[PDB]
Every structure is written in structure tokens, then in C-alpha cells.
Amino acid sequence: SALGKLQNVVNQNAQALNTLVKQLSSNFGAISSVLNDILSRLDKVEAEVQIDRLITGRLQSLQTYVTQQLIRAAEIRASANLAATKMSECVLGQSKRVD
Amino acid sequence: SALGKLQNVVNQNAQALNTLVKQLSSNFGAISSVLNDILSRLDKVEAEVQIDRLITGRLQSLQTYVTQQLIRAAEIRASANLAATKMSECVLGQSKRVD
Amino acid sequence: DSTECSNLLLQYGSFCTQLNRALTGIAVEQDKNTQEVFAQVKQIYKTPPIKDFGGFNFSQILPDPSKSKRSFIEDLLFNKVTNGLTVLPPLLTDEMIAQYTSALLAGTITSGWTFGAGAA
Amino acid sequence: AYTNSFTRGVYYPDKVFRSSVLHSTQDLFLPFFSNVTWFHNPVLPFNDGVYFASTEKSNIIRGWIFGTTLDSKTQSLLIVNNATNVVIKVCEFQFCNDPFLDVNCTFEYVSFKNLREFVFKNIDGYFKIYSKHTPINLVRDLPQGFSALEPLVDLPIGINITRFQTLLAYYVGYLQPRTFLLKYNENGTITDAVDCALDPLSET
Amino acid sequence: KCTLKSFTVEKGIYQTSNFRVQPTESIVRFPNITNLCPFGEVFNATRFASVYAWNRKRISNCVADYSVLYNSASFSTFKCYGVSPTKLNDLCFTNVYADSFVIRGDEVRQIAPGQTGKIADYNYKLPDDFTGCVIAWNSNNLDSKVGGNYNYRYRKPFERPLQSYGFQPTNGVGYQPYRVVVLSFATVCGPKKSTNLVKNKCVNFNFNGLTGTGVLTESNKKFLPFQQFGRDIADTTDAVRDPQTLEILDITPCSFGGVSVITPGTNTSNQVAVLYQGVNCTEVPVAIHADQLTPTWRVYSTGSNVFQTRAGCLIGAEHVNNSYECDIPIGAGICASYQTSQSIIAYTMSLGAENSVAYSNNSIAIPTNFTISVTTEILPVSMTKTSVDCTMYICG
Amino acid sequence: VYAWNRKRISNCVADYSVLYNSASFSTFKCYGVSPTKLNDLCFTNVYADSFVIRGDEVRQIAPGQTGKIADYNYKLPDDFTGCVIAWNSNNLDNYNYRYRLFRKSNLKPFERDISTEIYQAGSKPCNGVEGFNCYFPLQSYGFQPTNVGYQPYRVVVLSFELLHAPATVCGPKKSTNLVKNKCVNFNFNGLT
């Protein structure tokens, strides 16, 4: 429980990747989430109409992941700037800044 | 090569706008990506089905840009707050904060 | 790798590229952060064989060849934290990070703040 | 009269090896700590699907009859163990309700100290059987503990079922659509489960 | 140059493409073929009932070897009203109804589908549009006794008209009565194909209708006897039981990863080096254009210089035992640079000069001089201010 | 259906309203364009494809359709821009109207094929002569007044070309003076 901040970075990265993989199995309103079913069970126009739902859902799922990682990266950068400042003032010096 | 931070800011704004323009060439699953083709080739009831694909794709293209600009603006603000702090502490004073 | 799907994916243009461009900016930044924090010091200082630091005992925090270069406490810390998709290695390995924490620490013990302001 | 189910009646939901993992699934399951009817034969509704058990070491309980009428007109399951084999048929005769001694068929198939337990369900035109056999000490209520029933049989027979009866100590409970969390061990057996609806802690 | 949409490239490492090991062959495994359809006994039988009362049967999910009816040219006749016998052996009967006797009179060919006549409408029924094919055997071999159709009444296939019949006992299946093994549409389905099994090679596969691509391997995973395949934490299938010999395979995804081009600026040289991210060099000489096509590209695949690194297989750069500041980054302490007669080298980066401070319990160092130093620092402060009319952008 | 005839159409004014308003036609389905709009457009070429079939087969004349006509006689490309037109022609009913019953594989979009080889559905290598489940591949509709899905129907398919090539077949619209420097609405060759 002392290292909760570092363990949370590990957990958030794993949770995000695991969710991005689980969204492969969702229908998004399509006839199946396994792509060979849609290709093999239907005539060409019906297959193309069904596949565009899976493309839309997976593409929206991937933009959701990348946007979440962009916001999470900005939080980690704000902490890396604090750690670089702490090392410069506290290790390489003796700060008089209270707390 | 010293000014790589400032020339990067100019480059990012240019690539974002050029990407936002280039997505006007994309079909998004409509019979054409040029809106006057649809309006000249098809009668009113048939045309709406095509136009709503382009509206959906162009709107998602623009939401993607505005979201990344909101995140990019927050990164520049964190730099502007630091530059304002460096001017108050380094220029208007003398700073004992190591490095 | 379905062909019919991979043709339909072209209808959307630059989306499956600005995703890679965004993630690449994040990936490079993680190597920058690690360098901003640890690479303060210009030379790899190391401690003398003697340990006459006036009665203070740094043996828990200094490097140990029995412990990679990691200190005793760094070995606690490294034990207490535990597709189409790919994970990429960092630019600096844990053995390089451990040489920077060693250099910072060995400078600090032997030379005060002076290794930041000039030569140690 | 009634007795408690405790945590009996879990079964392997699919033919899949999951190992050292917790899996969440929705199926027709017997709800945890629900009541179960007890009997020492009567004719019973099948509902959505049946959990059945009996204290046995003797083959007094020769098997079961299932159907809509379960008699005299229409294709109906007869399931029997006659010691020569387990035997299955889908016939429509007005045959005897107790054809054993003083103790159309378009598909056909052949293959106390203890308790025998069974699950019967009928989905997408397939009739499915899961089961177990175990030693016991308590006989007048189901023994408190855990055991996952495993698939025997999975038949394409397409017959409707709403009613069934035992061919002459035995217990009946009914499956319901519920979500369960299943603990698969390193050797791919289910070893514990949580009924997610049961109480706020199970839901958590 | 195409990746960057420009004819000039500045110094750097650029991801240009994805490497992906291709499936080398296709493999199929299904359970041993058994419980074949019994109706071939009707084709082999020496007699049948007349078209007024043709006997009938049903399939019971049995194995319909319908391709054997394509070999049924020993029949005196044949007829069709749908797909070929090879297509029937590649499919299944949606209805079980099957033959047990003969057609006769004007309807004599109704042992097979596509027939016409009175008996072919009911008591020896064989529709003009029934979805299949059949052979027919004449009264001279299988369709009737020595009385022919003249002993009786006539006009699924070869199964259940009132007129007095007259088709000859000695004739072929057009002039005589005719009977055979036959049916018309889960009721009875074609035989399951299979191949031999391969390990430690990237393949396309089918096991019991589980389909995918992977390197199949032997494994110690302890499936229960009723279990047929196994799943990952993210539910992906990753182990299977071979249905023909019940061992447990472990399925590995065939290797893939980004391809990155290390380059100096195009002012300095047109020479480059190539990194296959996370790949092991033995698993290259495989897949895409970079191995397949030209000396100039396969120089960066199949020889020249090849060097495994913790980041991936690196090709076209020379490994060096010195260490330097990092020019172009690669990963895991490796960097690359263009050097002098000239080539790209790859090396472990150097953190800085080694130093031991001359510490002792009574020594101090004091500076006797100084230098004033003027240093530059640069910060961005503002973006380009923008406005977008979304009605004009979206609707033009 | 196997000798289906293509005529190129070029260098003219056209009026598709004459076609669309004709009581003769039992179907007039158009793809990639609406029949009302054709008189506003201009095309780089037009091609008319024509044949006779049994009336039930008309429904196979579409992009992405399937069946014997599409497999073995005449198939539209998946992005076909054009119109499909058909009508009953009972006055023609007659056994001359050949179609293809089997082929070694399905034919390509706008492909045509004269081949007459004996195909084999039975196991025998019949090598150019008929026998047990092996057959000559061109056979004909029995068109008679006694036939509705078996009746003779005449067919025309208009294929339209919308290339960067010059304007070549135009609807009945009239040109006007080439104004400059003013803000104008405009239409050149259907580019509005």
C-alpha cells in the first residue's frame, strides 16, 4: 500500500489494453462479431452493409482508447515535471520552500 | 536548431489544419465525396441517405480535431504559466532555486 | 487481415494514421520524461572504497553487486510493484536508471550541492 | 415440503478449458440458497429447466418421462437406466406410467451411501443433460458444500417439454436466468461460485 | 518518402510499414467419419414396390456421402432438379425424406428428382424442382420383379398413381419402372474433410469449426475429458484438442511488428537501416516485399549485416563495441549513427565520463577563479488562434 | 443471353423522360442516378446491352445479385451506374433463346462467352460427349403463350460513363452566354 501511485500506473495501462481487446467481441448491432460469419452467411451487399457496423464500432473504440491515453499522458507529464523539479531543488540543492 | 520548441508549435498547427482539409476528400461510404455530385445525380429521398454519411464522417473528423486542440492548448498553457513564473522569479528578482 | 474489410476501411481516409501519429507523440514523451528526471548529472560519479562519512551509514541506499546495480532499498521497490497491439521498450533500461541514481547519490554524499553548480 | 439448495447445482456452461481465472456468465442456473421440493410418483412441471437429485445406490429410480402431454399421442422423451445401459427414446405411445416390476421414436440412443444429481434443459432444439455422482452423510436435505455438474448428453431432438415424471429420497428445483461468477482452478475445474443477485456483497 | 509524402527526409527513425508472418499452408481436423446414410442398400436391392405405393424412409443426422451418387453411373437412368452430387456432399438435407421403392409407367424416372407424371405428384413423388440429383436402376436390375409395372399401378424421390401400369420388366429405367437410393430437402449431412497436422510452423487452421491462423505447438495443458478448446484472460482461443488423436495443442499468433527505417538526412546519404520491432532475426527472411523483392530491399532482409537487439531484429547497420551519445534512438540502450568509407553504426549509448571524487575525511577543494556563463532557455507561450465555421466545413 | 448484344451510344442529345414515361416497361430501376435527373446530366459514353430472358430471371440483373444468368451469361460490376429496363414480349413465343446451364467457373462483370463444352456433374471424364450427369451447356427457354415467370421478356441495360473524358451524350438542356467576373451559379456538363 506504500507504492499505490506506481501500482496504479501499472493497473491503468493493463485495464485500458484489456478493454480495447474485449471490444473486439461486441456486435455494435451487426449480425455477428466474428468477421468470417458476416462474409460467409450473406450475399456481397448484405455483408458490406453488416461489416460497416463492425468497422464503425472498432474505429470508435480505438479513438476512445487513444483519447483516454492522451489525457492520461498529460497527467503523467505533469508528475514528471514535478519529479524533475524535486530532483533539481532537493537532491542537487537544499530548498527553503516549506513542505 | 536551438529554436526546435517554437518551430514545432508552428508545424503542429499546420499538420492539424492540413489533415482537417484532406478529410473533405474522403467518401465515408457515400457514392461520392463531392457534395454537388450527390445533389446533381440523385433525387431528394435518395440523396439524404448519401448526405447523412458525409455529415456523420465530416462531423466526427471535426470533433477529433477540436478534442486534440483542447489537449494541445492545455500543454501550451502549462508552458505559458512556467514562462510567466520564470519572468517573475528570474528577471524581476534573483532566484535561489537550484537549476 | 480480412481483404473485403480492409478495402472498406479505405473509405474513412486519415483516421488509421492520425491515431498512430498521436500514440507516437505519447511514446516519445515517456523517454523524454525519464531523461528530464534522471539525467541531471553530466558525469557518472562513483563512491570511494573507504566509507568514513562521519558515522552516517548509506549502505541501504548505495549500489550493491549482489543486489543488476540496484541498491538494497531499490530491490524492495522493484519487488513491491507487480492482437494488432504492441508494447515498445523504453530508451533507458533499469540498469541505466540505476547508474544515474548511483551517480546522483555518490555526488551528493561526496561533494554537497557543488556537483550541480559546477565541477564536484 | 421444502429444503434449501445451499450452493449445489452449478454446471460447466460450455465445453471450454479456462484455468486459474474468474469468469462471469449468464445462463439458466439454480439460484443460490433457494428452496427445493422434497419427495419420497407425482407428475411435475419442467418450467425453464430442471435441477434433479436423489439419494441412490440401488436403481430404484429407473429414469424419467418428459413432454407436453408426456402420454398417449405425441413424441415424448423416455430416459431409462436398465443396468444393461442408459437408454433414450422419443416415442408417442399410451404406454404404462410405471412399467417396472414390484420394486414416433425418430431418435433413439444407448450408452443411501450416495447421491446422484442431474440438470435437464432444452435450448435451440437441443435437449441437454449434465450430472454428478457423490457419497453423502445427510439424506433428508441436500448436503452443504460445492460440486460442478458436467455434460453427459446433448441431443438434436427438437421436442417441446413442459412436464415430466420420475420412474420409481429425491429433490426438484428450477433453473432461472441469472449471472454467476465462476472460479476456475489451475486444472480447469470450477471450484467456487458467486450468484451475483443473491445479496449486496455478492453483487459487489 | 511515400510514408512522409515528400521527396526529402530529415535524420530520424520512421515507422513505414507492418511486418506479418504469413500462413504457409491450410490444415483441417474433424472427428473420424462414421454413421453413414443407409439408403445405399436401396440402390443395391434387387426389387422395389410399384409407383402407386412407393415405400419411404427418413435420414437421422447420418453422414450423407452424396458424392458416391456422382459415381452411380451403374444406374440405368439419372435425373436432377437442383445442385450437383458434389454440391450435395458439400452440404446437408434440410428435410429427412428418403427413398425405399420404385416409380412406374409414364412417371418411371421418379426414383430421381426433376421427373414428371401422375405417380411423380404423390405415390412415387419426385418434384420438377426438388433441390438435388439421383441415379435410377431399371426393372431389369432393381426397380421391380418379373411382372414389371404391368403387375401393379402407376402414372422424396423413390418414395410416396392410381392408373393400371404397363412399364416392361426387362427394360432400362425410362421404359421399365425405376428405383434407387434417393432423397430431397440437419436431416443428413456431408462427410467431414481432414488433413495431416503440423507443429512449429505458421499455418491457417480448422479444428471442429474453430478457425484461425497460428503456429500450432504441442502442450502440457490439462483439459478435462469433455473440453475441446481453451481461452485466454481476454477470451481469445489459445489451445485446442485435435479431434482425430486427442492431444492438446497450444496456439501461438504468427509473428508481427512495426518496420522502422533508420536514416541520416537525405543530404548525407541514401543509405538506410531497418528495424523489425520485437521480431527475432530467424523469423525474418519471411513475409512482405522487404524479403521478397529486389536486391536493394532484400539487402535489408536476407544478409548484408543482421543483428538481434532487445528492441527487435536490426538489419543494414554495423554493431560497434565503443559507446557514444545517442544520435538516433532505437530502444533498450541501443542507438544508431552515420559514421566514417562510411556506414550506419549501432551502439550502446554512454551516460557520461566515469569519475571517482577524491573524498576523504580531511580534504576540501576550493575554487580559485570563476567564469560568468550566459545560457539560453526557450519556452512556447501561444498557439495559432483559429476559428472553424462547421456549417461551411460540413455542408459547403 | 449468351450472345448478349452491346451497342455504343455517342455524340447526341438524349431525352430519358421518353423512356421513363413509356407505358411499355415493367421495370425501370436505376443505380447511382435517379431517372428524373438523367435529363440534367451529360455523359462521356453510353452503352446499351440487350437480350431476351424468361420473366422471372429479370430480378438477377443487378450489381451483387446471384443465379444462373449472373453466373454463366451476363453480370453487372459492383459499382454499376445505369438503368435496367424490361418488358414482357409474348408475341416472340419459340425455342431459339439459349442460355448457359453450367460452366467450369462463374464469368466476370460484362464478360461474354460462346463456349459449348460438355460439363460433368457425375464422376465420369466425359471428354466432349454427353452421358450420366454430363451435358452440353447451351439450352433454350421453351417460350410459348402457355407459360408468368417462364414467359419471354425483352431486356435493355443502359450503362453510363462518368469519366474525366469529354461530354458526349447530354440531356435536352440548353446552353447560355459565358458570363465572367460576377458571382454566378453555374453548370458545366453536369458539374454544378
Ligand SMILES: *[C@@H]1O[C@H](CO)[C@@H](O[C@@H]2O[C@H](CO)[C@@H](O)[C@H](O)[C@H]2NC(C)=O)[C@H](O)[C@H]1NC(C)=O
Ligand atoms: C551499516 O549498516 C548495515 C545495516 O544497515 C550493517 O550491516 C549489517 O550488520 C549486522 C550486524 O553485523 C548484520 O546482522 C547484517 O546482516 C548486516 N547486513 C548486511 C547487508 O551486511 C553494516 O555493518 C554497517 N556498516 C557500518 C560501517 O556501519
Ligand SMILES: *[C@@H]1O[C@H](CO)[C@@H](O)[C@H](O)[C@H]1NC(C)=O
Ligand atoms: C423458502 O425458504 C425459507 C427459508 O429461507 C422458508 O421459510 C420458506 O418456507 C421457503 N418457501 C418456499 C415457497 O419454498
Ligand SMILES: *[C@@H]1O[C@H](CO)[C@@H](O)[C@H](O)[C@H]1NC(C)=O
Ligand atoms: C436394457 O437395455 C438393453 C440395451 O442397453 C436392451 O437390449 C434390453 O432389451 C433392455 N432391457 C430392458 C428390460 O429394458
Ligand SMILES: *[C@@H]1O[C@H](CO)[C@@H](O)[C@H](O)[C@H]1NC(C)=O
Ligand atoms: C406413432 O404415431 C401414432 C399416432 O400418429 C401413435 O399411435 C404411435 O404410438 C406412434 N408410434 C410410436 C413408435 O411411438
Ligand SMILES: *[C@@H]1O[C@H](CO)[C@@H](O)[C@H](O)[C@H]1NC(C)=O
Ligand atoms: C412447440 O411449442 C411452440 C410454442 O412454445 C409452438 O409454436 C410449436 O408449434 C410447438 N411444436 C410442436 C411440434 O408441438
Ligand SMILES: *[C@@H]1O[C@H](CO)[C@@H](O)[C@H](O)[C@H]1NC(C)=O
Ligand atoms: C492438478 O493436476 C496435477 C497433474 O497435472 C495433479 O498432480 C494435481 O494434484 C492437480 N491439482 C488439483 C487441485 O486438481
Ligand SMILES: *[C@@H]1O[C@H](CO)[C@@H](O)[C@H](O)[C@H]1NC(C)=O
Ligand atoms: C540539406 O542542405 C541544405 C543546404 O544545402 C539545407 O538548407 C537543408 O535544410 C538540408 N536538409 C536536411 C533535411 O537536412
Ligand SMILES: *[C@@H]1O[C@H](CO)[C@@H](O)[C@H](O)[C@H]1NC(C)=O
Ligand atoms: C480415428 O481413426 C484412426 C484409425 O482410422 C485411429 O487411429 C484414431 O485413434 C481414431 N481417433 C478417434 C478419436 O477415434
Ligand SMILES: *[C@@H]1O[C@H](CO)[C@@H](O)[C@H](O)[C@H]1NC(C)=O
Ligand atoms: C529468439 O531469440 C533468442 C535470444 O533472444 C534466441 O535464444 C532464440 O534462439 C531465437 N529464436 C530463434 C528461432 O532463432
Ligand SMILES: *[C@@H]1O[C@H](CO)[C@@H](O)[C@H](O)[C@H]1NC(C)=O
Ligand atoms: C566486440 O566485443 C566482443 C565481445 O563482447 C568480441 O567478441 C569482439 O571480437 C569485439 N569486436 C571488436 C571489433 O573489438
Ligand SMILES: *[C@@H]1O[C@H](CO)[C@@H](O)[C@H](O)[C@H]1NC(C)=O
Ligand atoms: C581567471 O580566469 C580568466 C579566464 O576566464 C583568466 O584570464 C584569469 O587570468 C584567471 N585568473 C586567475 C588568477 O587564474
